[PDB]
Amino acid sequence: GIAQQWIQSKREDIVNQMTEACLNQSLDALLSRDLIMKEDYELVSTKPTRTSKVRQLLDTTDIQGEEFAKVIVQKLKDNKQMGLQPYPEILVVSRSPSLNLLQNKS
């Protein structure tokens, strides 16, 4: 995909730039929008370290696809942290290109 692929390529850079406050705001918005049940919310919030909480959030991202990942990317743009400026096509671009063979490396 796109937002889930961006996460599955720069997960540790996202986890370094974002904080438990960004993660908590994402989880709170997801719970307010009923994208996460309390049963999964506690499994994503019982980890002993903030780094591992986001690692569990990123597993739930792959179950949902291009919606649960898109709000994490939107939360980063709303929090204007500048470390992630090469953002993906999360319906936020001024004019989206043809999105055909854009090319990729890691």
C-beta separation of 46 from 54 below 8 A = no
Q: How far is CA 28 from the centre of its chain?
A: 13
The pair of three-digit structure tokens given for residue 76, joined into one six-digit string: 């980063």
Architecture of the domain spanning 1-106: Orthogonal Bundle (1.10)
**Three-class DSSP labels, 28-88:** HHHHHCCCCCHHHHHHCCCCCCHHHHHHHHHHHHHHHCCCHHHHHHHHHHHCCCCCCCCCC
Distance between CA 28 and CA 33 in Å, rounded?
9
Method: NMR
Alpha carbons 18 and 54: distance in angstroms, whole number: 9
Element (H, E) at 5: helix 3-17
The full set of domain ranges for the chain reads 1-106
DSSP tag of 27: H
Angle at the Cα of 55 (from 92 to 39), degrees rounded to 5? 95
